Design a protein around this ligand. Structure first.
Ligand code: AR6
Ligand code: 7KE
Ligand code: ZN
Length: 302
């Protein structure tokens, strides 16, 4: 039915495709891997990832600290962890500024991020460019569906940095930031943007994510079957034979390596280096390095 769009399954092939008139709209799908070079830990890297460093909270399992039913029984661990990450001021990475450059080149249809560090915004992506798929800590809400009283960040800090579990002033239920926990619905914007974006995406750029949580993992299968998909990641993600307990639905994954591979490319390494390499192939490398240099300087000056 649809023609094949990559002339070869390499970064060079993706680069030639991006410079063609057929690549008009790029969607970026990113996770915590795009911020580790800034100093923010990811979740699932062995030894260094967050989930291997929560022994002190004596959880039944690491994910419980971000699960809504456990949170409602034992909310203290999450708030203790939240103040462990608060003090750091972080700069966006080369990878963040590559997405910013896609925006300035008119190619960025949308960035879907699982991160809450807001570094996409700090890099210059605007609200309409972004789907913060796993929420934000900027706003908070009571957890009672009958209440849902909204509280600002200043209110949340006042409770946290004063050693009190935030409780709603109307119903005394727990109040948490609008970070999406396991068991919680995603923002409505996620679905309204998804329904429209993935009908008109020419390239999926998947960076710094293990694709281990739904529904975000489903997004790679929402693109048209002809749409090339480039992974820039330390490890292959989304490619595996089926097995009991797999996260992806049947046939919902990447195919980099089988005899039937036709559109998926894995560039294995650091996200910063992968974006530099891709920029170089596109003739954008000095432009990208200038952007990072000038934007990091402007951040420091302010
Ligand atoms: N500098 C790097 N360069 C390239 N890849 C990297 C780098 N650092 C890490 N990686 C890779 O980046 C990937 C990190 O995958 P995960 O740690 O699962 O982060 P997520 O965003 O997918 O977790 C999503 C949700 O799961 C949680 O429950 C939360 O709800 C999250 O929102 C790995 O494949 C690393 O090899
Ligand atoms: O389901 C999405 C959860 C996103 C989330 N990540 C964090 C976090 C807190 C502290 C540290 Cl060190 C690292 C990460 N909080 O919420
Ligand atoms: Zn309430």
């Amino acid at each position: 039915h649809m023609e094949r769009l990559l002339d070869e399954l390499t970064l060079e092939g993706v680069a030639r495709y991006m410079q063609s008139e057929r690549c008009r709209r790029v969607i970026c799908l990113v996770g915590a891997g795009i911020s580790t070079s800034a100093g923010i830990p990811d979740f699932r890297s062995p030894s260094t990832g967050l989930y291997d460093n929560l022994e002190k909270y004596h959880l039944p399992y690491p994910e419980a600290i971000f699960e809504i039913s456990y949170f409602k029984k034992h909310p203290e661990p999450f708030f203790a962890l939240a103040k462990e990450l608060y003090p750091g001021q972080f700069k966006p990475t080369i990878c963040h500024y590559f997405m910013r450059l896609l925006k300035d080149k008119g190619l960025l249809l949308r960035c879907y991020t699982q991160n809450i560090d807001t570094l996409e915004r700090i890099a210059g992506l605007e609200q309409e460019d972004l789907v913060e798929a796993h929420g934000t800590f900027y706003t908070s809400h009571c957890v009672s569906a009958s209440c849902r009283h909204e509280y600002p960040l200043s209110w949340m800090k006042e409770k946290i940095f004063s050693e009190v579990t935030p409780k709603c002033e109307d119903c005394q239920s727990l109040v948490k930031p609008d970070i999406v926990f396991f068991g919680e619905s995603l923002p409505a914007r996620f679905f309204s943007c998804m329904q429209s974006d993935f009908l008109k995406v020419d390239l999926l750029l998947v960076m710094g994510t293990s694709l281990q949580v739904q529904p975000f993992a489903s997004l790679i299968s929402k693109a048209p079957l002809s749409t090339p998909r480039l992974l820039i990641n330390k490890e292959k993600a989304g490619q595996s034979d089926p097995f009991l307990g797999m996260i992806m639905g049947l046939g919902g994954g990447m195919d980099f390596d089988s005899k039937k591979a036709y559109r998926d490319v894995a560039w294995l390494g650091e996200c910063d280096q992968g974006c530099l390499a891709l920029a170089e192939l596109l003739g954008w490398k000095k432009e990208l390095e200038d952007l990072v240099r000038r934007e990091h300087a402007s951040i420091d000056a302010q």
